[PDB]
């Protein structure tokens, strides 16, 4: 009677699946799989009332469970990481996340029990298994406080005598710029002998975190830098070579 | 009598395989494998009525089951992932999928219990084990909402005084173009000092998602960009060098 009840229940489940709309063969095969697994479990549980010695059954069940345990590790791992994300999550719906270990970049669209759906920056959906969030470092640019401007000014080797003043000038321009956050790092220094140029690093932060505003401020700063460099009598260096001709 | 019945059943199976059409030698070897497996299982189950002490049998069965369980991990993992895909699938038949972790690019043709068949873009079939879908990130470009146009305009360093206006002009052209989606990201900014050029980024989206229509719109935009750049007295930069000769 227990087997009859279970068979009726799963047959109702299969009929419900078919009504919802699915392939005939796939539904029948799934129902047959449920048949076989239920029968195996019941025989493993009813192996003494009409069954056999509890030593062969122990070995058979152990081998089967051991194979099933190794085979099903990844699916269960994804679902466990989903529970973990439900309780402890480093991100929320709608913020931009990133990783230096894997490519998961985009904005979080949905958090599920098995996978997380992320909208990439070319407007495509990306489905990330949840277990990844238990082993990789996750960055959250959606929670940043400042945007950073970094660049290099490569002057010609003949402009060495003009390096110092130029550096000072650039620094002054950055300390009076309305878009630059004066409470963050602000560095302008000559710090590299390159192959064809002397390199000055520029390193600062903007107040805003908006993409377009940061880009506009960066363009303004770059144009001002060009003006400063050219007004002092220096120039930007192309890749350079010394040629000895026969 | 149980062994006789099982032997008759598998012999009928072998004859059916031969009738369906298969190598006779391979069928005989398969039938012999089924023989040996059935005999081993039955002895493991009937090891007390006429068998031995239930301590050596336990050890033998444990060693055998441990080896069999670790050897069969991959096949069972593929089938478990097939069941998972039957219940929870990030794609349907006919859409184009991709992955940043493995090369699986193409359009989904068939979803099976063990493998998934995908048609590549050079019209070849590719068979992907299902277990991969439990551990890699899957992108679905077949479900995209927009296509993206990104490019770089590289102007000569002598065109610095013409950067600003050019940027504005390009931006205006993108805001009046009938093929550009005005509700998405639209960025045109000077954002890079390159080795031989000043670089302006172009970043926008098209309304359509069709391949040929997107390519036609991109070609139209590129030709308009060339016209805008040349009409303002600037030019595109080749790789440049400064040469010092003896
Ligand atoms: C020791 C392990 C040995 C290997 C494991 C057994 C694999 C053999 C399964 C073959 C069954 C099979 O192909 O049967 C056909 C389909 O059955 C099916 O629908 C497939 C059933 C698959 C069951 C897999 C075993 C589940 C075990 C549960 C315990 C956990 C019957 O063909 P048909 O007539 O239905 O053809 C339908 C079209 N007309
Ligand atoms: C742990 C180890 C587990 C190993 C499992 C090995 C046996 C599974 C593969 C062979 C069984 C296939 C069963 C099968 O296809 O029978 C269906 C009945 O379902 C059923 O309800 C058949 C139940 C058979 C259970 C046998 C379990 C023995 C475990 C010891 C057919 O039914 P249909 O109406 O689709 O057939 C008409 C179409 N050909
Ligand atoms: C066999 C097991 C099969 C799985 C089914 C059972 C799942 C059980 C889940 C555990 C219940 C945890 C409930 C914790 C509730 C709670 O308040 O914890 C919060 C999350 O903490 C945390 O960080 C909790 C993390 C728990 C991770 C779950 C592990 C995977 C499950 C497998 C923070 O704690 P608080 O008290 O400071 O909260 C105040 C600030 N929100
Ligand atoms: C007997 C011996 C068995 C030996 C091991 C066999 C392991 C084989 C793999 C087992 C994987 C079971 C996955 C859980 C099923 C989830 C399910 O049906 O519900 C989903 C949500 O469940 C949830 O809410 C998540 C379920 C939480 C994980 C389960 C924790 C207990 C462990 C269960 C198996 C124990 C063995 C539906 O929602 P959805 O996933 O479609 O929706 C979000 C989509 N992203
Ligand atoms: C402890 C483990 C030790 C290693 C495991 C045993 C491997 C040795 C198997 C050798 C059998 C073999 O080569 O026999 C020949 C072919 O048998 C065959 O057809 C090959 C049968 C392979 C059976 C493998 C063992 C299954 C164990 C099941 C438990 C799970 C007989 O040659 P022939 O006369 O048939 O030559 C046919 C052309 N004329
Ligand atoms: C867990 C551990 C499992 C270890 C398995 C080791 C034994 C397997 C390899 C040796 C057996 C080969 C059997 C074999 O080839 O015999 C066939 C009979 O099949 C049969 O039906 C022979 C059944 C032998 C079962 C022995 C199992 C012992 C387990 C303890 C030959 O038949 P044919 O007509 O093709 O021969 C004429 C052509 N040479
Ligand atoms: C030893 C075991 C050997 C394997 C043989 C047994 C396989 C059992 C399969 C589990 C039955 C799950 C039935 C779920 C039905 C269902 O509606 O679930 C849907 C899928 O959920 C999910 O996400 C379900 C995912 C479960 C994946 C299977 C795990 C691996 C199996 C090994 C969504 O759930 P909803 O109720 O929101 O649906 C509303 C939208 N249709
Ligand atoms: C006793 C101790 C045994 C120790 C472990 C031994 C493990 C060795 C590997 C076991 C692999 C079993 C494979 C399942 C057979 C599948 C089968 O015959 O039917 C296929 C579909 O079945 C289906 O519908 C898929 C079957 C569902 C997965 C099996 C879940 C129960 C676990 C069974 C073994 C338990 C132990 C036919 O269709 P096709 O695959 O050709 O069609 C789609 C092609 N892509």
From Swiss-Prot, chains A, B:
<dbReference type="GO" id="GO:0005886">
    <property type="term" value="C:plasma membrane"/>
</dbReference>
<keyword id="KW-0407">Ion channel</keyword>
<dbReference type="GO" id="GO:0042802">
    <property type="term" value="F:identical protein binding"/>
</dbReference>
<feature type="topological domain" description="Cytoplasmic">
    <location>
        <begin position="11"/>
        <end position="37"/>
    </location>
</feature>
<keyword id="KW-0472">Membrane</keyword>
<protein>
    <recommendedName>
        <fullName>Low conductance mechanosensitive channel YnaI</fullName>
    </recommendedName>
</protein>
<dbReference type="GO" id="GO:0008381">
    <property type="term" value="F:mechanosensitive monoatomic ion channel activity"/>
</dbReference>
<keyword id="KW-0406">Ion transport</keyword>
<comment type="similarity">
    <text>Belongs to the MscS (TC 1.A.23) family.</text>
</comment>
<feature type="topological domain" description="Periplasmic">
    <location>
        <position position="59"/>
    </location>
</feature>
<comment type="function">
    <text>Mechanosensitive channel that protects cells against hypoosmotic stress when highly overexpressed.</text>
</comment>
<keyword id="KW-0812">Transmembrane</keyword>
<feature type="topological domain" description="Cytoplasmic">
    <location>
        <begin position="81"/>
        <end position="246"/>
    </location>
</feature>
<keyword id="KW-0997">Cell inner membrane</keyword>
<comment type="subunit">
    <text>Homoheptamer.</text>
</comment>
<keyword id="KW-0813">Transport</keyword>
<keyword id="KW-1003">Cell membrane</keyword>
<feature type="transmembrane region" description="Helical">
    <location>
        <begin position="38"/>
        <end position="58"/>
    </location>
</feature>
<keyword id="KW-1133">Transmembrane helix</keyword>
<dbReference type="GO" id="GO:0071470">
    <property type="term" value="P:cellular response to osmotic stress"/>
</dbReference>
<feature type="transmembrane region" description="Helical">
    <location>
        <begin position="60"/>
        <end position="80"/>
    </location>
</feature>
